[PDB]
């Protein structure tokens, strides 16, 4: 498919596809994405720099910037620990065939005229702005600190530092990257992704949560944990194992049964998958059963790569 | 001796013990903050007064100019709000202080400071900081995030200082308490009395023109303590009976007709109080020595601001 239809599929929106269009007639293009450094890299991190490599593919120079300021700033730990978690992930993203370029929040976030440039974004930002903005990403928090409030406008005058085309980010960002289009003159082209159920279907996938696939998870690993995942029969929306199939998977897919229940089948796209289950043609452990066989091949190189560091 | 002189019309001492073991040094310093002001008024006189006290009990004194902090308290932009911190350096030196100046934005931008900034920001609640700002932040109908900023940017101020006690009005106290919970050296923090303003409506400041400035000339110094509040008997939130008894010297002469019986001559405010609880001394008595004695001690500082104009 074109470049914009590679960029475009399995977003959840383009902000807005117009200017996207006119950023991809250009010779030279940007894209970052933030990550506040994981401990593990989930699908979740996975189904974003996926986004990243089909920018890369479409001519875009890739920035990464591990966010150890903002995890710092989101009650994450102590900044040379984060960095060095940052480290880890910059290797993951690398085992995933990204080709980017990293920097850590902290080389610039520090320096005279970005802090007064954050001071003046808090004149200009409301405490109830920067909470709702906050919403999705703050640490639980029984007593909430101020470092939830300078977060979203540290973030706000990251992305007017870094000064690309096109800033990529889940549907969590989405409130902190609107602040920015209206605090800020220079008008980002935003990029979202959605984000992952958690595998018992209670929420979205988070790492503090553990409710997710690592992308180096061994395959009984994944397995153990697909066969205990939510998936009621029927149910598409909130079915975490319908989402590894939509976000991840091949098509055509071959989805293998004993011929006692219908034999093989071969699926050629994940609409056709989608009616098959709201059908009830297609069991959940059959389901279940071909999403994790397929899924341990798709991370088996990045496993794979990983491993053979030691 | 050195701790009555210090102690004399303040409204508190935190704590008293850890002053008397200041007192114990050879070296020891004191620092104040003000927010630029473009008038200077008795309410900041009284804390100059009391920070000559402390230089002439051997500390040396540095005094904040805070534009930062007043940045952040949507005072203006920096460049206007470091002119006036300069016309302030300008009236504290006529006022007699010998003190080193600097602004806190000489400082308040290192990384490192920034860093311990936001190292506060993880300790301090939203709630407290809110808390610690009601009797200083600007009032805002959507309160900012730059509120939240200031109170522990002044913290760290004081981190930064290292100094041994911290001076300013009671409406810093609870900035200073912050400080004193989250900073690893505590420092002793004095606090001196906040004015009444002059219609008794509530206390003096900047904002809401109710003061006396020290360069206000003879004249309207007299119409300002002609409308003022001033009940018979009255002491409480009387403004007159404040500046007898913080700026005013005794033995101190009241003139009144000897119609009146004198020239009545008092040689303690403790006296002057007495009589006017009683109603021996009336409003507009008090008022004219009130208002004649502030001009003559007014006077010099107005007199070498004047010769600025050559």
Redesign the interface.
Known sequence: MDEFEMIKRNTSEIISEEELREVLKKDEKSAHIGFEPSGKIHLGHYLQIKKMIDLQNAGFDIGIVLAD?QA??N?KGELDEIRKIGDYNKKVFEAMGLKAKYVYGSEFQ???DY??NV?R????????R?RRSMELIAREDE????????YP?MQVNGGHYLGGDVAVGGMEQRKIHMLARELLPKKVVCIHNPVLTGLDGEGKMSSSKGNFIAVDDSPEEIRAKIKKAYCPAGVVEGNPIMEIAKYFLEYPLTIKRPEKFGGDLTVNSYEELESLFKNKELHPMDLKNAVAEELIKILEPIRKRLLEHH
């Open positions: 300021l710092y700033l009650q520090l320096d005279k802090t007064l001071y974004l808090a004149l200009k930002t409301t405490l109830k920067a007593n909430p600190k101020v470092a939830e409030v300078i406008i």
